[PDB]
Short mmCIF file of all heavy atoms in Angstrom, two decimals:
data_model
loop_
_atom_site.label_atom_id
_atom_site.label_comp_id
_atom_site.label_asym_id
_atom_site.label_seq_id
_atom_site.Cartn_x
_atom_site.Cartn_y
_atom_site.Cartn_z
N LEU A 12 -39.51 137.53 89.50
CA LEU A 12 -40.23 136.79 88.48
C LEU A 12 -39.76 137.07 87.05
O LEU A 12 -40.11 136.33 86.12
CB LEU A 12 -41.73 137.09 88.60
CG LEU A 12 -42.31 136.71 89.96
CD1 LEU A 12 -43.76 137.15 90.06
CD2 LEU A 12 -42.19 135.21 90.15
N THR A 13 -38.95 138.10 86.88
CA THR A 13 -38.47 138.46 85.55
C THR A 13 -37.04 138.00 85.29
O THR A 13 -36.33 137.61 86.21
CB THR A 13 -38.55 139.99 85.38
OG1 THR A 13 -37.40 140.60 85.98
CG2 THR A 13 -39.78 140.52 86.08
N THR A 14 -36.63 138.01 84.02
CA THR A 14 -35.27 137.63 83.65
C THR A 14 -34.52 138.94 83.42
O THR A 14 -35.02 139.83 82.72
CB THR A 14 -35.25 136.76 82.36
OG1 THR A 14 -35.83 135.48 82.65
CG2 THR A 14 -33.82 136.55 81.86
N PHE A 15 -33.34 139.07 84.01
CA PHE A 15 -32.55 140.29 83.88
C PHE A 15 -31.13 140.03 84.37
O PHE A 15 -30.86 139.00 85.00
CB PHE A 15 -33.19 141.41 84.70
CG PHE A 15 -33.14 141.18 86.19
CD1 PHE A 15 -32.05 141.62 86.94
CD2 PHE A 15 -34.16 140.50 86.85
CE1 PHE A 15 -31.98 141.38 88.31
CE2 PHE A 15 -34.10 140.26 88.22
CZ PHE A 15 -33.01 140.70 88.95
N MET A 16 -30.23 140.96 84.10
CA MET A 16 -28.85 140.81 84.53
C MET A 16 -28.64 141.37 85.92
O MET A 16 -29.15 142.44 86.25
CB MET A 16 -27.91 141.54 83.58
CG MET A 16 -27.82 140.94 82.19
SD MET A 16 -27.20 139.26 82.21
CE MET A 16 -25.50 139.51 82.62
N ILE A 17 -27.90 140.64 86.74
CA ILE A 17 -27.58 141.11 88.08
C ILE A 17 -26.22 141.77 87.89
O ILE A 17 -25.23 141.10 87.58
CB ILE A 17 -27.46 139.95 89.10
CG1 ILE A 17 -28.82 139.32 89.35
CG2 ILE A 17 -26.92 140.49 90.41
CD1 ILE A 17 -28.78 138.10 90.25
N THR A 18 -26.20 143.09 88.01
CA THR A 18 -24.99 143.89 87.86
C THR A 18 -24.79 144.62 89.20
O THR A 18 -25.63 144.48 90.09
CB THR A 18 -25.18 144.94 86.74
OG1 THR A 18 -26.24 145.84 87.09
CG2 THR A 18 -25.53 144.26 85.43
N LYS A 19 -23.71 145.37 89.36
CA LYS A 19 -23.53 146.08 90.62
C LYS A 19 -24.69 147.05 90.84
O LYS A 19 -25.13 147.25 91.98
CB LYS A 19 -22.22 146.85 90.64
CG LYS A 19 -21.00 145.99 90.87
CD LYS A 19 -19.80 146.84 91.18
CE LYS A 19 -18.54 146.03 91.04
NZ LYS A 19 -18.46 145.45 89.66
N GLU A 20 -25.18 147.63 89.75
CA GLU A 20 -26.29 148.56 89.83
C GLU A 20 -27.63 147.89 90.18
O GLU A 20 -28.31 148.31 91.11
CB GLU A 20 -26.46 149.32 88.51
CG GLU A 20 -27.74 150.16 88.52
CD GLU A 20 -27.91 151.05 87.30
OE1 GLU A 20 -27.99 150.52 86.17
OE2 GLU A 20 -27.98 152.28 87.50
N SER A 21 -28.00 146.84 89.45
CA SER A 21 -29.26 146.14 89.72
C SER A 21 -29.23 145.44 91.07
O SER A 21 -30.26 145.31 91.73
CB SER A 21 -29.57 145.13 88.63
OG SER A 21 -28.65 144.05 88.64
N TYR A 22 -28.06 144.95 91.47
CA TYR A 22 -27.91 144.28 92.77
C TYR A 22 -28.29 145.29 93.83
O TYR A 22 -29.05 145.01 94.75
CB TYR A 22 -26.46 143.88 93.03
CG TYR A 22 -26.24 143.43 94.46
CD1 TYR A 22 -26.70 142.20 94.90
CD2 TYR A 22 -25.62 144.27 95.39
CE1 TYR A 22 -26.57 141.81 96.22
CE2 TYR A 22 -25.48 143.89 96.72
CZ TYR A 22 -25.96 142.66 97.13
OH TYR A 22 -25.87 142.29 98.46
N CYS A 23 -27.73 146.47 93.67
CA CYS A 23 -27.94 147.56 94.59
C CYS A 23 -29.37 147.95 94.79
O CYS A 23 -29.84 148.00 95.92
CB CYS A 23 -27.09 148.75 94.15
SG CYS A 23 -25.71 149.05 95.26
N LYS A 24 -30.07 148.22 93.69
CA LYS A 24 -31.48 148.59 93.74
C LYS A 24 -32.33 147.50 94.38
O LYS A 24 -33.28 147.79 95.10
CB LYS A 24 -32.00 148.86 92.33
CG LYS A 24 -31.18 149.88 91.54
CD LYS A 24 -31.90 150.23 90.25
CE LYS A 24 -30.97 150.71 89.14
NZ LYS A 24 -30.41 152.07 89.33
N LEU A 25 -32.00 146.24 94.11
CA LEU A 25 -32.74 145.11 94.66
C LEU A 25 -32.52 145.06 96.17
O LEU A 25 -33.48 144.88 96.93
CB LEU A 25 -32.28 143.80 94.02
CG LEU A 25 -32.75 143.57 92.58
CD1 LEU A 25 -31.91 142.48 91.95
CD2 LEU A 25 -34.23 143.21 92.56
N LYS A 26 -31.28 145.20 96.61
CA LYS A 26 -30.98 145.18 98.03
C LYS A 26 -31.75 146.30 98.74
O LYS A 26 -32.38 146.07 99.77
CB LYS A 26 -29.48 145.34 98.25
CG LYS A 26 -28.86 144.23 99.10
CD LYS A 26 -29.47 144.19 100.49
CE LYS A 26 -28.90 143.05 101.34
NZ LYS A 26 -29.63 142.99 102.65
N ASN A 27 -31.71 147.51 98.19
CA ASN A 27 -32.41 148.65 98.78
C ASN A 27 -33.91 148.51 98.79
O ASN A 27 -34.59 149.22 99.53
CB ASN A 27 -32.06 149.95 98.05
CG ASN A 27 -30.68 150.45 98.36
OD1 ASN A 27 -30.14 150.19 99.45
ND2 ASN A 27 -30.09 151.19 97.43
N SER A 28 -34.45 147.62 97.98
CA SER A 28 -35.89 147.45 97.89
C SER A 28 -36.48 146.46 98.87
O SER A 28 -37.71 146.36 99.01
CB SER A 28 -36.28 147.03 96.47
OG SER A 28 -36.06 145.65 96.29
N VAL A 29 -35.63 145.72 99.56
CA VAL A 29 -36.11 144.72 100.50
C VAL A 29 -35.38 144.87 101.83
O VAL A 29 -34.19 145.19 101.86
CB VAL A 29 -35.89 143.29 99.93
CG1 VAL A 29 -34.40 142.99 99.84
CG2 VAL A 29 -36.62 142.26 100.76
N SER A 30 -36.11 144.68 102.93
CA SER A 30 -35.48 144.81 104.24
C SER A 30 -34.47 143.69 104.34
O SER A 30 -34.64 142.64 103.71
CB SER A 30 -36.51 144.65 105.36
OG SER A 30 -36.93 143.31 105.45
N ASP A 31 -33.43 143.90 105.13
CA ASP A 31 -32.42 142.87 105.30
C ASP A 31 -33.02 141.62 105.94
O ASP A 31 -32.59 140.49 105.66
CB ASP A 31 -31.29 143.40 106.17
CG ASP A 31 -30.21 142.38 106.39
OD1 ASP A 31 -29.34 142.23 105.50
OD2 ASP A 31 -30.24 141.70 107.44
N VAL A 32 -34.02 141.81 106.80
CA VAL A 32 -34.68 140.68 107.44
C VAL A 32 -35.39 139.82 106.39
O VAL A 32 -35.26 138.60 106.40
CB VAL A 32 -35.68 141.19 108.51
CG1 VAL A 32 -36.64 140.09 108.89
CG2 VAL A 32 -34.94 141.66 109.73
N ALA A 33 -36.14 140.46 105.49
CA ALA A 33 -36.86 139.74 104.44
C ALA A 33 -35.87 139.04 103.51
O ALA A 33 -36.08 137.89 103.12
CB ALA A 33 -37.73 140.71 103.64
N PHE A 34 -34.81 139.75 103.15
CA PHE A 34 -33.79 139.19 102.28
C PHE A 34 -33.25 137.88 102.87
O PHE A 34 -33.23 136.85 102.17
CB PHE A 34 -32.63 140.18 102.10
CG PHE A 34 -31.53 139.67 101.21
CD1 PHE A 34 -31.66 139.73 99.82
CD2 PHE A 34 -30.38 139.09 101.75
CE1 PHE A 34 -30.66 139.21 98.99
CE2 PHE A 34 -29.38 138.57 100.93
CZ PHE A 34 -29.52 138.63 99.55
N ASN A 35 -32.82 137.91 104.13
CA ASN A 35 -32.27 136.71 104.78
C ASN A 35 -33.28 135.58 104.90
O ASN A 35 -32.93 134.41 104.83
CB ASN A 35 -31.70 137.03 106.16
CG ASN A 35 -30.40 137.82 106.09
OD1 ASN A 35 -29.64 137.71 105.12
ND2 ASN A 35 -30.12 138.59 107.13
N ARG A 36 -34.54 135.94 105.10
CA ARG A 36 -35.58 134.92 105.20
C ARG A 36 -35.73 134.23 103.84
O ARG A 36 -35.89 133.02 103.76
CB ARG A 36 -36.90 135.54 105.62
CG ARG A 36 -38.02 134.54 105.65
CD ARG A 36 -39.28 135.17 106.15
NE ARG A 36 -40.42 134.31 105.84
CZ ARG A 36 -40.90 134.12 104.62
NH1 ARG A 36 -40.34 134.74 103.58
NH2 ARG A 36 -41.94 133.31 104.43
N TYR A 37 -35.69 135.03 102.77
CA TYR A 37 -35.78 134.50 101.41
C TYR A 37 -34.58 133.59 101.16
O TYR A 37 -34.71 132.50 100.63
CB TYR A 37 -35.77 135.65 100.41
CG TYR A 37 -37.08 136.40 100.32
CD1 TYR A 37 -37.11 137.73 99.90
CD2 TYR A 37 -38.29 135.75 100.58
CE1 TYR A 37 -38.31 138.39 99.74
CE2 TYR A 37 -39.48 136.41 100.42
CZ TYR A 37 -39.49 137.72 100.00
OH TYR A 37 -40.69 138.36 99.82
N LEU A 38 -33.41 134.07 101.55
CA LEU A 38 -32.17 133.32 101.38
C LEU A 38 -32.28 131.96 102.08
O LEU A 38 -31.84 130.93 101.55
CB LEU A 38 -31.02 134.12 101.99
CG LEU A 38 -29.59 133.63 101.78
CD1 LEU A 38 -29.31 133.43 100.29
CD2 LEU A 38 -28.65 134.66 102.37
N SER A 39 -32.86 131.96 103.28
CA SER A 39 -33.00 130.73 104.06
C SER A 39 -34.01 129.74 103.48
O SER A 39 -34.06 128.59 103.90
CB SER A 39 -33.41 131.07 105.49
OG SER A 39 -34.78 131.43 105.54
N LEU A 40 -34.83 130.19 102.54
CA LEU A 40 -35.82 129.31 101.91
C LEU A 40 -35.32 128.71 100.59
O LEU A 40 -36.04 127.93 99.94
CB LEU A 40 -37.11 130.09 101.68
CG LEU A 40 -37.83 130.55 102.95
CD1 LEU A 40 -38.98 131.48 102.62
CD2 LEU A 40 -38.34 129.33 103.68
N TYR A 41 -34.10 129.05 100.20
CA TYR A 41 -33.53 128.57 98.94
C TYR A 41 -33.50 127.05 98.78
O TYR A 41 -33.96 126.53 97.77
CB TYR A 41 -32.11 129.12 98.74
CG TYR A 41 -31.49 128.68 97.44
CD1 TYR A 41 -32.02 129.08 96.22
CD2 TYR A 41 -30.40 127.80 97.42
CE1 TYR A 41 -31.51 128.63 95.02
CE2 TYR A 41 -29.87 127.34 96.23
CZ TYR A 41 -30.44 127.75 95.03
OH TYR A 41 -29.95 127.27 93.83
N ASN A 42 -32.95 126.35 99.77
CA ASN A 42 -32.86 124.89 99.69
C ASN A 42 -34.21 124.23 99.60
O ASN A 42 -34.38 123.27 98.84
CB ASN A 42 -32.11 124.33 100.88
CG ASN A 42 -30.65 124.68 100.84
OD1 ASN A 42 -29.97 124.40 99.85
ND2 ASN A 42 -30.16 125.31 101.89
N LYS A 43 -35.17 124.73 100.36
CA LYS A 43 -36.51 124.16 100.33
C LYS A 43 -37.09 124.15 98.92
O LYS A 43 -37.76 123.20 98.52
CB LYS A 43 -37.45 124.95 101.24
CG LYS A 43 -38.91 124.62 101.01
CD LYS A 43 -39.81 125.51 101.82
CE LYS A 43 -41.27 125.18 101.57
NZ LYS A 43 -42.15 125.98 102.45
N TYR A 44 -36.84 125.21 98.16
CA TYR A 44 -37.36 125.31 96.81
C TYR A 44 -36.44 124.75 95.74
O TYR A 44 -36.90 124.30 94.69
CB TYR A 44 -37.73 126.76 96.51
CG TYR A 44 -38.92 127.23 97.30
CD1 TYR A 44 -38.78 128.13 98.36
CD2 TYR A 44 -40.20 126.75 97.01
CE1 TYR A 44 -39.88 128.54 99.10
CE2 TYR A 44 -41.31 127.16 97.75
CZ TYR A 44 -41.14 128.05 98.78
OH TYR A 44 -42.25 128.47 99.47
N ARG A 45 -35.14 124.78 95.99
CA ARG A 45 -34.18 124.24 95.04
C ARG A 45 -34.39 122.73 94.92
O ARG A 45 -34.17 122.14 93.86
CB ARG A 45 -32.76 124.55 95.54
CG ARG A 45 -31.65 123.70 94.96
CD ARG A 45 -31.38 124.01 93.52
NE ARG A 45 -30.12 123.39 93.12
CZ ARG A 45 -29.54 123.57 91.94
NH1 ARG A 45 -30.11 124.36 91.03
NH2 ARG A 45 -28.39 122.97 91.66
N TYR A 46 -34.84 122.12 96.02
CA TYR A 46 -35.08 120.68 96.07
C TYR A 46 -36.54 120.37 96.44
O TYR A 46 -36.81 119.51 97.28
CB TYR A 46 -34.15 120.02 97.09
CG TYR A 46 -32.68 120.29 96.84
CD1 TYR A 46 -32.00 121.25 97.58
CD2 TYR A 46 -31.99 119.62 95.83
CE1 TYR A 46 -30.66 121.54 97.31
CE2 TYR A 46 -30.66 119.91 95.55
CZ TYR A 46 -30.00 120.87 96.29
OH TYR A 46 -28.68 121.17 95.99
N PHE A 47 -37.46 121.08 95.80
CA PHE A 47 -38.89 120.92 96.04
C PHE A 47 -39.43 119.76 95.19
O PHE A 47 -39.26 119.76 93.97
CB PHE A 47 -39.62 122.21 95.66
CG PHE A 47 -41.04 122.27 96.13
CD1 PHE A 47 -41.34 122.79 97.38
CD2 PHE A 47 -42.07 121.80 95.33
CE1 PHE A 47 -42.66 122.84 97.83
CE2 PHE A 47 -43.38 121.84 95.76
CZ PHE A 47 -43.69 122.36 97.01
N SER A 48 -40.09 118.79 95.83
CA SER A 48 -40.66 117.65 95.11
C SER A 48 -42.13 117.89 94.82
O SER A 48 -42.90 118.25 95.72
CB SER A 48 -40.54 116.37 95.95
OG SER A 48 -39.20 116.00 96.19
N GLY A 49 -42.54 117.72 93.57
CA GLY A 49 -43.94 117.90 93.23
C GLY A 49 -44.40 119.23 92.67
O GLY A 49 -43.61 120.01 92.15
N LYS A 50 -45.71 119.47 92.79
CA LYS A 50 -46.36 120.68 92.29
C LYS A 50 -46.11 121.95 93.09
O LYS A 50 -45.90 121.91 94.31
CB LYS A 50 -47.87 120.47 92.19
CG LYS A 50 -48.32 119.55 91.08
CD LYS A 50 -49.85 119.46 90.98
CE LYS A 50 -50.47 120.76 90.50
NZ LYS A 50 -51.94 120.62 90.32
N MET A 51 -46.17 123.08 92.40
CA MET A 51 -46.00 124.37 93.03
C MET A 51 -47.13 125.33 92.71
O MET A 51 -47.20 125.87 91.60
CB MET A 51 -44.68 125.01 92.60
CG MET A 51 -43.45 124.43 93.27
SD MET A 51 -42.14 125.66 93.31
CE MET A 51 -42.70 126.63 94.67
N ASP A 52 -48.03 125.54 93.67
CA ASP A 52 -49.12 126.48 93.46
C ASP A 52 -48.46 127.84 93.26
O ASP A 52 -47.43 128.12 93.89
CB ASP A 52 -50.06 126.51 94.67
CG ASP A 52 -49.32 126.69 95.99
OD1 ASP A 52 -48.37 125.92 96.24
OD2 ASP A 52 -49.71 127.58 96.78
N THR A 53 -49.02 128.68 92.40
CA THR A 53 -48.45 130.00 92.13
C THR A 53 -47.94 130.71 93.39
O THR A 53 -46.83 131.24 93.39
CB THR A 53 -49.45 130.92 91.40
OG1 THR A 53 -50.66 131.02 92.17
CG2 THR A 53 -49.77 130.39 90.01
#
């Protein structure tokens, strides 16, 4: 939810903070949201 730079260091910490399963699930939801029509409840 925040704005920040993705560097080798920040990439690393982010990867270590989420299970690989969750990461891939998030990755798989990209298109759905990149091309979402209409309103978005929080």
Side-chain angles (χ1 to χ4, degrees):
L12 300 175
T13 82
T14 291
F15 68 89
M16 292 299 289
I17 291 175
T18 62
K19 284 193 195 56
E20 172 174 62
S21 68
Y22 169 74
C23 251
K24 307 188 206 287
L25 286 163
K26 235 299 178 185
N27 286 332
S28 80
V29 67
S30 72
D31 180 82
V32 164
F34 180 81
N35 288 332
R36 177 176 165 289
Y37 284 154
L38 188 53
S39 76
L40 295 172
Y41 181 65
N42 291 305
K43 167 185 179 176
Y44 291 108
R45 160 71 167 186
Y46 304 101
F47 193 89
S48 297
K50 288 184 69 176
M51 283 206 79
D52 50 308
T53 56

